[PDB]
Design an enzyme around this catalytic site. Structure first.
Site, PDB file in Angstrom:
ATOM      1  CG  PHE A   1      43.112  42.847  46.960  1.00 51.88           C
ATOM      2  CD1 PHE A   1      42.572  43.437  48.090  1.00 51.88           C
ATOM      3  CD2 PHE A   1      44.166  41.961  47.111  1.00 51.88           C
ATOM      4  CE1 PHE A   1      43.077  43.156  49.343  1.00 51.88           C
ATOM      5  CE2 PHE A   1      44.677  41.679  48.362  1.00 51.88           C
ATOM      6  CZ  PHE A   1      44.130  42.275  49.481  1.00 51.88           C
TER       7      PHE A   1
ATOM      8  CG  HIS B   1      48.141  39.932  47.677  1.00 53.38           C
ATOM      9  ND1 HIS B   1      47.342  40.267  46.606  1.00 53.38           N
ATOM     10  CD2 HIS B   1      47.773  38.682  48.045  1.00 53.38           C
ATOM     11  CE1 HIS B   1      46.524  39.265  46.339  1.00 53.38           C
ATOM     12  NE2 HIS B   1      46.766  38.291  47.197  1.00 53.38           N
TER      13      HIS B   1
ATOM     14  CG  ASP C   1      47.649  34.169  48.144  1.00 53.41           C
ATOM     15  OD1 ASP C   1      47.315  35.367  48.009  1.00 53.41           O
ATOM     16  OD2 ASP C   1      47.129  33.241  47.490  1.00 53.41           O
TER      17      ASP C   1
ATOM     18  CG  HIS D   1      48.329  36.874  43.329  1.00 56.84           C
ATOM     19  ND1 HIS D   1      49.189  36.219  44.184  1.00 56.84           N
ATOM     20  CD2 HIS D   1      47.122  36.883  43.942  1.00 56.84           C
ATOM     21  CE1 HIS D   1      48.532  35.856  45.271  1.00 56.84           C
ATOM     22  NE2 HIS D   1      47.277  36.247  45.149  1.00 56.84           N
TER      23      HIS D   1
END
Ligand SMILES: CC(C)[C@H](NC(=O)[C@H](CS)NC(=O)CCC[C@H](N)C(=O)O)S(=O)(=O)O
Ligand SMILES: [Fe+3]
Length: 330
Positions: free
Chosen positions: A210, A213, A215, A269
């Site tokens: 992933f 980004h 959160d 992260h």
């Protein structure tokens, strides 16, 4: 091409449940120091039985059938379920997509709830598997929602004191009757062979599950099994976050960064690719649909900020759509 490790302090958050106000401030200082550094910390002495949480989560993922997955699938996988934008099952795609998950919302979102009656976006009624096929699963899941709600409420008191505010500055907007908070029960499977189409390559060459980004949350309260995977971005590149399957990994979301004028950043992260069976169980601490926190700047003597007050419902709706557009349908 070597990778250093992030400083992720373990913070005894137990004073945040008590009435020792000086002890709370010492916790709030530790939260402040972590929020100004890498942005992550581990909450320890939290009072949640995370061992039974991982057990019931493992039993569910491993026993649910393709038929039940279709029956619970969100709209992205089942055109028949137009009301399931958030809650429901997120199907894996063998050979293309490894991750799968089950997301549920506030159990108080029932057909009687006025937000459901008014069809307000981001509000949905949870879907659940058959009780006899998954005995005790829904009871466990709903109780865990309120278990982690209680921990998150105390964590919000620490963040409020850390920023120089009264301890209910955030928690007063965090209520059981309207919170848009969600739980996602994510399974990352072991696969042999692992589909390369399920692996993404970062700009620096790192193989990812992933991509990077921030959160979409106020804060995120995350439990993960003992498989290292997370990395936080610093000015010197991405740094490994060490795993700890006894504590809760805490970080701010972009709503916190907005209201503090980026004083508490939302740490960027990403999730490294690891061929290992593991669980990731985030609780995204969201406020109410109408919840509005006046922004401020703790670096200014007057604390004045020129940022607009942002309604949380509009922030959440735009944030979840943008994250899907940027990092793909999960
Ligand atoms: C499933 C995996 C790919 C994991 N990704 C995430 O969970 C991401 C990054 S935090 N967040 C979301 O997708 C928002 C979910 C919102 C929820 N549906 C709701 O309605 O509240 S992982 O890679 O980070 O482990
Ligand atoms: Fe995240």
């Amino acid at each position: 091409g070597s990778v250093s490790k992030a400083n992720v302090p373990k913070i005894d958050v137990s004073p945040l449940f008590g009435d020792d106000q000086a002890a709370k401030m010492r916790v709030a200082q530790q939260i402040d120091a972590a929020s100004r550094d890498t942005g992550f910390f581990y909450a320890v002495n939290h009072g949640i039985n995370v061992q039974r949480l991982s057990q019931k989560t493992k039993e569910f993922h491993m026993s649910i059938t393709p038929e039940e997955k279709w029956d619970l699938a969100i709209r992205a996988y089942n055109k028949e379920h137009q009301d399931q934008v958030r809650a429901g099952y997120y199907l894996s795609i063998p050979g293309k997509k490894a991750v799968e998950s089950f997301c549920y919302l506030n159990p108080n979102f029932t057909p009687d709830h006025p937000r459901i009656q008014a069809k307000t976006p981001t509000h949905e009624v949870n879907v659940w598997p058959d009780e006899t096929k998954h005995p005790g699963f829904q009871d466990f899941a709903e109780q865990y929602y309120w278990d982690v709600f209680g921990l998150s409420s105390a964590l919000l008191k620490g963040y409020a004191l850390a920023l120089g505010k009264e301890e209910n500055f955030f928690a007063r907007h965090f209520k059981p009757d309207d919170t848009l908070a969600s739980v996602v029960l994510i399974r990352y499977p072991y696969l042999d062979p692992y589909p390369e189409a399920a692996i993404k390559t970062a700009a620096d060459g790192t193989k990812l599950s992933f991509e990077w980004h921030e959160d979409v949350s106020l804060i995120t309260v995350l439990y993960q099994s003992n498989v290292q995977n997370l990395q936080v971005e610093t000015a010197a590149g991405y740094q490994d976050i060490e795993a700890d399957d006894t504590g809760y990994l805490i970080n701010c979301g972009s709503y916190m960064a907005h209201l503090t004028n980026n004083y508490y950043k939302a740490p960027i992260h990403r999730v490294k690719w690891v061929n290992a069976e593991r669980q990731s169980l985030p609780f995204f601490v969201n406020l109410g649909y109408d919840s509005v926190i006046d922004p401020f700047d703790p670096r200014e003597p007057n604390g004045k900020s020129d940022r607009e007050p942002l309604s949380y419902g509009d922030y959440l709706q735009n944030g979840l759509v943008s994250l899907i557009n940027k990092n793909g349908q999960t």
